[PDB]
Amino acid sequence: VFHKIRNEDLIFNESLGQGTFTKIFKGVRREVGDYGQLHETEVLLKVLDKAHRNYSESFFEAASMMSKLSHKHLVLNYGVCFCGDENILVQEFVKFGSLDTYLKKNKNCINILWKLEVAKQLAAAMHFLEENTLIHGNVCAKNILLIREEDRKTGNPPFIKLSDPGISITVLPKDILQERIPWVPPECIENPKNLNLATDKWSFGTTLWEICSGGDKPLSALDSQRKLQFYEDRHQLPAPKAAELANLINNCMDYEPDHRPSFRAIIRDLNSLF
Numbered sequence: 001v002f003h004k005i006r007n008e009d010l011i012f013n014e015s016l017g018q019g020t021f022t023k024i025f026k027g028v029r030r031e032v033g034d035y036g037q038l039h040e041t042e043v044l045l046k047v048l049d050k051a052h053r054n055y056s057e058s059f060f061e062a063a064s065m066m067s068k069l070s071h072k073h074l075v076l077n078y079g080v081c082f083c084g085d086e087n088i089l090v091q092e093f094v095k096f097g098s099l100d101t102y103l104k105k106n107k108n109c110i111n112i113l114w115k116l117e118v119a120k121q122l123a124a125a126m127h128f129l130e131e132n133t134l135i136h137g138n139v140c141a142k143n144i145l146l147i148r149e150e151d152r153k154t155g156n157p158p159f160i161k162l163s164d165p166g167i168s169i170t171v172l173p174k175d176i177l178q179e180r181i182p183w184v185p186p187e188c189i190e191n192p193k194n195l196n197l198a199t200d201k202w203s204f205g206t207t208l209w210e211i212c213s214g215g216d217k218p219l220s221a222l223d224s225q226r227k228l229q230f231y232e233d234r235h236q237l238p239a240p241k242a243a244e245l246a247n248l249i250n251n252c253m254d255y256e257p258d259h260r261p262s263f264r265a266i267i268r269d270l271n272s273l274f
């Protein structure tokens with residue numbers, strides 16, 4: 001069950017972008033906080049499209065399943081608004097936003113050690129999810145959010161959190177899944193019901209490719225039919241320019257799901273690049 005937040009206590013401000021069948025807004029929540037102090041808290045508001053109310057169950061289940069776990073690398077859910085007839089999630093506002101946009105804007109000021117640290121953090125989150133046998137199912141750089149920048153003065157590294165997967169690929173139209181190649185693994189293009197913990201290992205590889213490519217999108221030049229051929233011919237992504245993690249990427253993006261390494265093994269390999 002989700003906490004109910006009064007429409008009166010929520011103000012919607014700027015549009016930040018779109019998810020699958022969703023609109024994303026920054027907003028403010030008036031709330032009673034610690035010691036009874038009133039706060040006006042920045043929040044991230046996800047609104048399900050009114051034309052896609054058919055997906056409301058999966059929209060809310062995506063956030064609900066992750067809200068029953070607590071972890072430093074997982075975005076906090078605050079509740080739902082209900083907001084009349086609207087379907088709205090209220091979650092933590094992460095100051096610097098999506099990692100994919102951040103990587104692009106700061107491509108020249110981000111070295112391999114920065115990318116390694118963020119990769120280790122993501123793998124930590126995914127290992128926590130694996131230990132809890134919780135499938136995410138939509139790991140990608142768009143869904144990783146940067147809480148804090150590197151601060152060389154105090155030696156603080158960047159710090160990320162993983163947001164919820166949104167509507168599940170087990171219910172999305174096939175065309176959307178094909179557009180999501182190569183984050184959606186080949187067995188899920190074959191059948192979305194093959195969604196498995198092994199799915200997230202494959203998607204983690206694709207996300208690491210994003211992190212190493214300064215925010216490029218793999219296979220973006222390929223339309224959906226060519227993305228299908230990419231899997232039919234069993235291709236692998238090119239090594240990123242920052243090729244230090246190329247081997248780890250391809251080992252995660254194993255066409256055999258049962259052979260993808262555990263996130264424990266992934267974390268050990270990330271720690272071994274030294």
Ligand SMILES: O=c1cc(-c2ccccc2)nc2c(-c3ccccc3)c(C(F)(F)F)[nH]n12
Pocket residue numbers: 016017018019024044092093094095096097098142143144145163164
């Ligand atoms: O907390 C935030 C904070 C910001 C954000 C956006 C712009 C500037 C600073 C922060 N942007 C997002 C998004 C987002 C927004 C548009 C497209 C993809 C992701 C998510 C979501 F949860 F949706 F992943 N949270 N978030």
